[PDB]
Symmetry: C6
Subunit: 207 residues, 6 copies
């Protein structure tokens, strides 16, 4: 990543073995659960496009998703080229192309040059926004259960039902559907509460 040293200047740092292993492990354990996306964003703090491509390529398996990611990246790369239509002088920064932001036609020194410019061209943050966009579309598609099928069981604790409800809702990307899909006993209690009840009040009443 590009990180500021202990003297106030932005310099390049090698991606750490702890960072590399943490990203690989979370994909192995959680696949494309919704909480994997913020983990990717945190673990790629200050990452260059090269670092972002590194993280994606260390993922073995889920290659269907990785190809969807490339398609989303190319869509965003093509949009950037339509919003930013371009001899380049000696020793002198060039504007980046979509494929430059994606790290495919640009060198690390070029990415360092853009990201540390004054003002900086944050090709890493632009690329990361493309990746998260594509990652979120994967999260929705891999969500196994629709919110319409999350209904509280006749003996299911309300707490467990709300857990499944909003876990599903988070991947699908509320309060009245949560009441409608509650079981008959709790749904009866939740209507007596009236409108405007908080989740805390609702869960307390069906305890």
């Amino acid at each position: 990543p590009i990180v500021q040293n202990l003297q106030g200047q932005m310099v390049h740092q090698c991606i750490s073995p702890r960072t590399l292993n943490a990203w690989v492990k979370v994909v192995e354990e959680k696949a494309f659960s919704p909480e994997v996306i913020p983990m990717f964003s945190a673990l790629s703090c200050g990452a260059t496009p090269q670092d972002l491509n590194t993280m994606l390529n260390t993922v073995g398996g889920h290659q269907a998703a990785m190809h969807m990611l490339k398609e989303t990246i190319n869509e965003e790369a093509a949009e950037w080229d339509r919003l930013h239509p371009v001899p380049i002088a000696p020793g002198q920064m060039r504007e980046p192309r979509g494929s430059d932001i994606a790290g495919t036609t640009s060198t690390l020194q070029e990415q360092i040059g853009w990201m540390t410019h004054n003002p900086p061209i944050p090709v890493g943050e632009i690329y990361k926004r493309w990746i998260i966009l594509g990652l979120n579309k994967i999260v929705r598609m891999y969500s196994p259960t629709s919110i319409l099928d999350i209904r509280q069981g006749p003996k299911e604790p309300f707490r467990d039902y709300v857990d499944r409800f909003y876990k599903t809702l988070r991947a699908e990307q509320t309060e009245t559907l949560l009441v409608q899909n509650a079981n008959p006993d709790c749904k009866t209690i939740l209507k007596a509460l009236g409108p405007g009840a908080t989740l805390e009040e609702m869960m307390t009443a069906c305890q």
Copy 2:
């Protein structure tokens, strides 16, 4: 987080893989036990609102609690706006809104600017206080057993009973109830001790 370097200036640091993994793991293992809250506070030392949102979003599951957390955060964010009613000049700090402190309408550079100002606007500590408030309400609600039902067994060691008693009491958020819920043999000993006995004296007498 925002941490001071080895030269005496406050700069931004990327949240570490060790920090990210430590928060995720403790939630996986302890859920919303009372001791999870001080762990969250320590692991979020110097955190920005972005870092605080990062930590919350890496939690998979317990999504019912996370939605209660959002409701508490919005309540505190709405209160801040009622206590701090607001053209913004070029290059110049703006007062934060409730959603700015919660990291939803503010950028990282803006959060860095507030937290490192002189005097600093500690939007991270303000947000953290909101989160801990909401986290504590979750701890009370998820406490499975009431203090009224913690009574020493006829053969239960007094040490084990006091452990369960104050473990329950900590989540519920004393000395006379501890005597009343003791078993007949120990309760007899504890009355002979008289008032003002310490916990050490009480546990010694029923050993």
Copy 3:
């Protein structure tokens, strides 16, 4: 903790995830064995009162001991107030109270101010001494076996017996009792050695 940087000045550092996890784990594995106390002291090197309270609060369970710890802390806090009886000027250090040293009525900035003063008021070391005092009283009470009941078995190796003997003695908080509680065969050998024998000589003779 408060640690000196690489330039010779005392500044605040966030308690590390490795430190937090190491304290939690040792309590989970060893409870209140005697060797847990020096581990707590080492892991709290340079800790502020806030850091000391952090470490105590990350302990889940053993809540009976934690309440005994609070009682000991309040006793020491009350003593400090009796030994140090107190408008506070603008921007100007105030003497600490017992509850200030215990981190309950003092801010982190105040604790940093005391600990880094010239001369420093080591509220962290004062608090730590209170905690270790209370922790040691827990170690004695949780010692399951009295030294009077540690006697060498008729076929127990002398090495194993001495291990149990001084393990028990360490928690209870010597040489002649070790001879008296030895088995008949070894006790006969140990009297023939005479007075003033070292532990090495004693263990060698009963090998």
Copy 4:
């Protein structure tokens, strides 16, 4: 590796135990899966030829591949000598040979001298490009299944089939073959979609 300190100068650093162990472990677990190559590239960030040889030599087993790697390295080393045909003055940098870039006839001080020169001779990056070239040829040869034999099962979820398809394709080093190898039911749906369908659209239709 050669890394810039916190003062802006490139100096030598010892390869870390975390780096050494991370490379060994990934080879033990994944052998020559395609994602092992980007892991090698990231873990060898800023590596000298000595560091690159270190990483290769810590690999136990897969010695057939390591000998293929040497053959590829010698081929690239011989090419470099044909593109760069060479008394060397006292204290004065010499041009490198193919075996110098491969770390076999050059010292660490010589590699440091080339890599930190102005302008730098990046013998580490040149060597790394040779290694990755040879590593990729191993990935293709060790790919067990050909893309022609990746066909969706009659009850295999389309997602799982695309995973295997592009996993195989990645090692072999698309969209119309993916349709042809789909099962009859899904292939019927995919033709109705028409040309130019994205992977996301294709996977959605066969869900």
Copy 5:
């Protein structure tokens, strides 16, 4: 420990959680095997007497050995007082006593003052030499098997026998006894080799 910063001055550093855990773990796994002593010496690099006492006190169990260690320490402390017989002026270093070097009557600031003096009084290295002396006496006593009882089996590989032979010899604290305790077949071969054979030659001949 006392370690030099990145600016060339000796300052105090808190003993690390990795150091504390590494010492505890090696004692748990290897007890008082001979190789535990050099591990203790390496892990206590630059340690103060306080750090050395910390490491000893984190050891749970083996309390018989720890009491032998104290007896050896007191013997060396008494010797130092006999070799170094002693108003102390304000703000001014005092010569250390045996108990000062052992960390029992001296503060950390005093130990820092001695160790960083010019010229330095290395109370840490003096104490460490006392500890290693006592630790080595424990290694000899806990050696279970005498060298006289290490004899090669009639079908035992010579390599395995030499391993046990010098493992035992290392704890007991050679070449002709190794031949005498070899089995008849190998002993016959080893006499034909003649005097002055290396261990490599000896092991080769009995392979």
Copy 6:
């Protein structure tokens, strides 16, 4: 080890717990496999003779090999004394002896003085070369199988056979013997290939 700080000067650093544990673990898991030697060389980057002796002494077991190592070290130490035959002035570097390079008659300060001299006397690298020499002789002797006995099985995959072939060859310290020891079916194919075939071509043909 001796490592350069972040200011460009060579200073002493304590051997890290990660380094110590990594060397011990690899010996426990791999014994004297060929790849253990480059691991030792990397983990001893910049090591002093004291650090090199530390690493050897933390190895428990394999004491036969460690005694062969001492014999090789003494041989190299005796050679150095024959190539470098020696009042030493106050405060003034002395030439090292063989036992000085091996760390047996020299202090750490003396080793630091030699290694950081201008020009430096690299007693650590000289000692390390002695150790690796002796370690390699152990690798050859502990190789269980000779290359003459590595022959491809009638149903053994050629890839697996080449793996065993060069694994054995690496420890023993090629292309025509690999053909001769192939099975009849593959050997027939390999002769049809003709001379000068690469390993990649050979393995491809027998696939």
